[PDB]
């Protein structure tokens, strides 16, 4: 403990002048730098292709479709088992993937609708359900064919 009888410590040793090695760096930063305003990244520097494969997740490059843009339920019907019975394997395969792509688009729209705006319109949901009906009909047809 530091009593009052304490005796000050000496300063630790210093190497003489003629023995001190000079530093490897002799110059340093500029003593004139000033704080400048940040520069935001600008989108003008980008050439986004209009045919980018991410547009396939949108219909007509629309953020979210309107009731007018959606296909009316009256004019739409899912595929029938007999109509899929006489479609070649390539045709069924292609229809499957078209159905899946449309379902992906509907899925993103429905997620934005039920997560952000939280509405209960349930239109995209039934449309995707119709597509799913066609899909399992295709599966049935392929199994029965084999």
């Amino acid at each position: 403990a530091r009593t009052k009888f304490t005796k000050p410590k000496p300063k630790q040793p210093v190497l003489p002048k003629d023995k001190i090695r000079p530093p490897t760096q002799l110059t340093h930063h500029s003593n004139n730098l000033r704080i400048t305003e940040p520069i935001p990244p600008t989108t003008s520097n980008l050439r986004c292709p209009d045919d980018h494969p991410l547009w396939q997740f949108f219909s007509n490059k629309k953020f979210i479709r309107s009731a007018d843009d959606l296909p009316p339920s009256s004019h739409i019907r899912p595929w029938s088992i007999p109509e899929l019975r006489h479609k070649s394997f390539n045709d069924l395969h292609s229809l499957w993937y078209n159905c899946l792509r449309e379902q992906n688009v509907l899925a993103r729209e429905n997620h934005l609708l039920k997560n952000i705006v939280g509405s209960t319109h349930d239109e995209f949901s039934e449309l995707s359900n119709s597509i799913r009906t066609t899909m399992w009909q295709i599966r049935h047809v392929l199994n029965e064919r084999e």
């Binding site: 429905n110 997620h111 039920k114 997560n115 952000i116 939280g118 949901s125």
Partner: protein
Amino acid sequence: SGSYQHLSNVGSRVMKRLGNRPKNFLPHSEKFIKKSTPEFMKSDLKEVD
């Protein structure tokens, strides 16, 4: 309404219990549903299953 509930089927037991309410207690839920909706939204007929 951020829930993610539209992506998974969780709590199947509870959901089935709520969706299969006994028919003799239906007025209990009918009352709250009716009194919790506006006049221009509601109808004077009994919802059916």
